[PDB]
Design a protein around this nucleic acid. Structure first.
Ligand SMILES: [Mg+2]
Lengths: 154, 168, 252
RNA sequence: GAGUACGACCAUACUUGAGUGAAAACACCAUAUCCCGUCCGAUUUGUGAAGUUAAGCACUCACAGGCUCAGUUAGUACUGAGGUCAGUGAUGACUCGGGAACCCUGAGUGCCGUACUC
RNA sequence: GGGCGGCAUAUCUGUUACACGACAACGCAGGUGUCCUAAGGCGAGCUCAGUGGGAACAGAAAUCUCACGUAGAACACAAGCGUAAAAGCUUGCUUGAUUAACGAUUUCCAGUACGAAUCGAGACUGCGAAAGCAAGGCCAGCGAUCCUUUGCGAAGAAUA
RNA sequence: AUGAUUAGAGGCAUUGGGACCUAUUCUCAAACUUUAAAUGUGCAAACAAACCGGCCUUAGCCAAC
């Protein structure tokens, strides 16, 4: 892009959303990051300090390092024929905790909800039947799809 | 109506706008200590205007904010030179007014042979008590639109305390 | 005429501040740094000594920041000092020290860490050099949050400071903004600070009010309406620190 | 049913203009001997408690501006795959899928947390 | 084509560039080899640009005062980001622009060096009541072997 | 909002030989944007792993455990 510095082509990318400006919030400071957790690097201008490079902005990986104001995070970057694991280190405002495994911890805890209702009790929520089966249709309203003459005059 | 809405004098502003670089101005800071009797503060210029002979950041004025008991005793001092007659356009719509004397020795100041003559400005600021809510560190808010002193409200205050001749 | 600043375009692109910034209650630039702790301290409890001095009340409370909202651990007020023998001051420097003592006694009894960590049973003005882990058993550590008050050398948010310090709580501080501290000599004076711990500076001015309003014919009206006297102001606090330090859970 | 202190989201909370406000509290307010800081006790600091809800704050009300949320615009614009499609071309339709935006219209106009209190 | 011209020869922001990243042309629009003992560090106080009402001489413009003012100002510089009890302005003390055990990393990439940068730990500190912030002024502003040259390896102990 | 860009409507005192203000309007933007696709792009989807209740250890953290 005629210059190959660190923040190049980051005009719209390191900007802030409309009426979403300002310094980071208190629930970002209090959000405690632990080693081994999936975080989600999103660079926060209005910090401008310890930002990731522009490549690591939609990305999400595993924390391997926690320092007093820093998070190391292992992020996969494909180079030529291989996907090597980049260990970047950012400030703590440039990471969000990742909800990537939210739908897996949900059906995991549903497998301790079930097996706590089968071995001891018997009460279960019923299994859901498919809407793709062949039922009967009771027509409560019928129309006629016919392409009237007055559909063209617009 | 309500005794909290008594229009008082908030401040009084004794502006001198010497214009010179500071030769005559150092006896213009002394002419105001024989007035209000607290330390004057200086004032430099914003830009450099060539026709006026003034450059940037050179001390070009002397002003003082005086409050309290001398805020009252320097309108009775200061409106003798007006004979209690100052116009209707001397009043602002924010509630305050002002007037400019032409020579200070017609107040009752003994004329020193070192300090010369000086004309001044006397811009008062009228307000009601409760103006603190616009000047606070914590819980700073605005004064509502019934409690501002108006132009028509500063008419009658000048005609019921000190004077009574606007003479439009 | 005059161009309107507040166009509909002004309102369409206006970004309002935080609610407690519009209201003028929070310095979020200091709120952020007070709440900030090391990320290696994985959510350890960090407590603020929130002191807020209104026109008629001193509010001292130990507060832990949460994402759902700050979690007040044992507040303490100055209007409940009449349960202890102080009917009169309640917004002076001598009731800042009592509210800080009554906070640091109710807080340690809340933890069970009282009868250890009591400290300075009779007060001086002298500096203590608080022992914290940044510097045996460690005292309970909270840091002092003045909010928006201007920290001047003699202010009453620093009377709650030595109230809490001489009550057994460990607040980190230097004695630079105590009243008996000299800027250019750089040496504390424990005489001048101890005098307004026990409200002596009220007593040389309650004396002038009862002496220059009896020869001449609203200041200290409810004290002159009372039977209260100078020389009975200073011992009124020393006895009232016994009522606090021995049983702090009492209130109105 | 409310206050105060700390608050989380940060306009459904803002802006303007009216209206109302039990208690208690906040708040204006009084003041300058000490602590302290100013051109100025204005702010600020201290020390107060005569006065008032005038103002702040709170709440309510606008064919209010804004904001928020659906709906419409509209299967429209645009676009992924296809053709020995059509058209001199510009470009357009069809086929298998995805599918907007402003204007406009309707709604309503903060919500949850801790400690202390009326 | 080569020559003249030029720099697309090291390098920075916007765009080309086709909503990750990467993408060419003597493609477009401008920068770079400097500058600063404060224009660095920090704390406190403050609010800017502009407009409107006002006040002797004093006008469109001198300075005082009030109101409104989401940044329309400023941040040495090209540009873009970002920023309002601040990152701007003023003031106060300061030297973290030092040292930093061969820690790890990012950008360019061959995942080499260089330049720039990030997250650390150690010494000694600065400002601050404190939490904190600070090892330059974010992000461009720079350079191998060989050779020259400077600094450090104070003296005083030690039957080794 | 910023950069362009036509035109009518009067606001009446805000002025000088359309300035100004308020609502609209015709028409646009590779280096403009409130909003925003289609196509893309990152991670997770149970066998060195997460899940559930004791123990040992640590000059890690916290006032303590
Ligand atoms: Mg040589």
């Amino acid at each position: 892009v005629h210059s190959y510095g660190y923040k190049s082509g980051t005009r719209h990318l390191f900007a802030k959303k409309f009426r979403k400006h300002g310094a980071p919030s208190v629930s970002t400071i209090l959000t405690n990051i632990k080693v081994g957790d999936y975080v989600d690097v999103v660079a926060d201008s209005a910090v401008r300090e310890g930002m990731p490079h522009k490549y690591y902005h939609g990305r999400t990986g595993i924390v391997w390092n926690v320092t007093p104001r820093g998070v190391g995070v292992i992020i996969n970057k494909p180079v030529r024929t291989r996907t090597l694991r980049k260990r970047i280190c950012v400030r703590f405002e440039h990471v969000r905790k990742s909800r990537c495994q939210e739908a897996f911890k949900a059906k995991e805890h549903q497998f301790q909800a079930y097996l706590a209702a089968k071995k001891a009790g018997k009460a279960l929520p019923p299994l859901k039947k498919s809407s793709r089966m062949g039922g009967i249709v009771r027509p409560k309203n019928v129309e006629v799809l016919a392409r009237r003459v007055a559909d063209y005059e617009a | 109506a309500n005794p909290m809405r008594e229009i008082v004098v908030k401040k009084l502003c004794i502006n001198i706008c010497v214009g010179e670089s500071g030769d005559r101005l150092t006896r213009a800071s002394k002419v105001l200590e024989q007035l209000c009797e607290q330390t004057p503060v200086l004032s430099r210029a914003r830009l450099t205007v060539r026709t006026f002979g003034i450059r940037r950041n050179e001390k070009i004025a002397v002003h003082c904010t005086v409050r309290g008991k001398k805020a009252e005793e320097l309108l009775e001092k200061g409106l003798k030179v007006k004979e209690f007659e100052l116009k209707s356009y001397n009043f602002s719509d924010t509630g305050s007014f002002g007037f400019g004397i032409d020579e200070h020795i017609d107040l009752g100041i003994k004329y020193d042979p070192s300090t010369g003559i000086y004309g001044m400005d006397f811009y008062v600021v009228l307000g009601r008590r409760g103006e603190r809510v616009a000047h606070r560190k914590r819980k700073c808010s605005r004064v509502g639109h019934s409690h501002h002193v108006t132009k028509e409200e500063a008419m009658k205050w000048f005609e019921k305390v000190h004077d009574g001749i606007i003479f439009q | 005429f005059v161009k309107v600043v507040k166009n509909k375009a002004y309102f369409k692109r206006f970004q309002v501040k935080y609610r407690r910034r519009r209201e003028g209650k929070t310095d979020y630039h200091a709120r952020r740094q007070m709440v900030l702790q090391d990320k290696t301290k994985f959510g350890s409890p960090k407590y603020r000594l929130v002191v807020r001095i209104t026109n008629k009340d001193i509010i001292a409370q130990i507060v832990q920041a949460k994402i759902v909202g700050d979690e007040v651990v044992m507040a303490a007020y100055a209007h409940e000092l009449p349960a202890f023998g102080i009917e009169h001051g309640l917004t002076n420097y001598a009731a800042a020290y009592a509210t800080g003592l009554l906070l640091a006694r109710r807080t340690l009894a809340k933890l069970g860490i009282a009868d250890k960590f009591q400290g300075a049973k009779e007060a001086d003005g002298s500096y203590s050099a608080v022992r914290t882990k940044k510097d045996e058993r460690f005292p309970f550590k909270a840091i002092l949050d003045v909010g928006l008050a201007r920290t001047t050398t003699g202010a009453r948010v620093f009377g709650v400071l030595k109230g809490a310090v001489d009550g057994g709580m460990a607040v980190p501080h230097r004695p630079n903004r105590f009243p008996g501290y000299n800027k250019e000599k750089s040496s504390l004076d424990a005489k001048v600070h101890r005098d307004r711990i026990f409200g002596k500076h009220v007593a040389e001015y309650l004396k002038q009010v009862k002496e220059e309003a009896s020869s001449n014919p609203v200041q200290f009206s409810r004290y002159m309406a009372a039977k209260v006297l100078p020389e009975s102001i200073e011992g009124m606090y020393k006895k009232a620190h016994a009522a606090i330090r021995a049983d702090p859970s009492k209130s109105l």
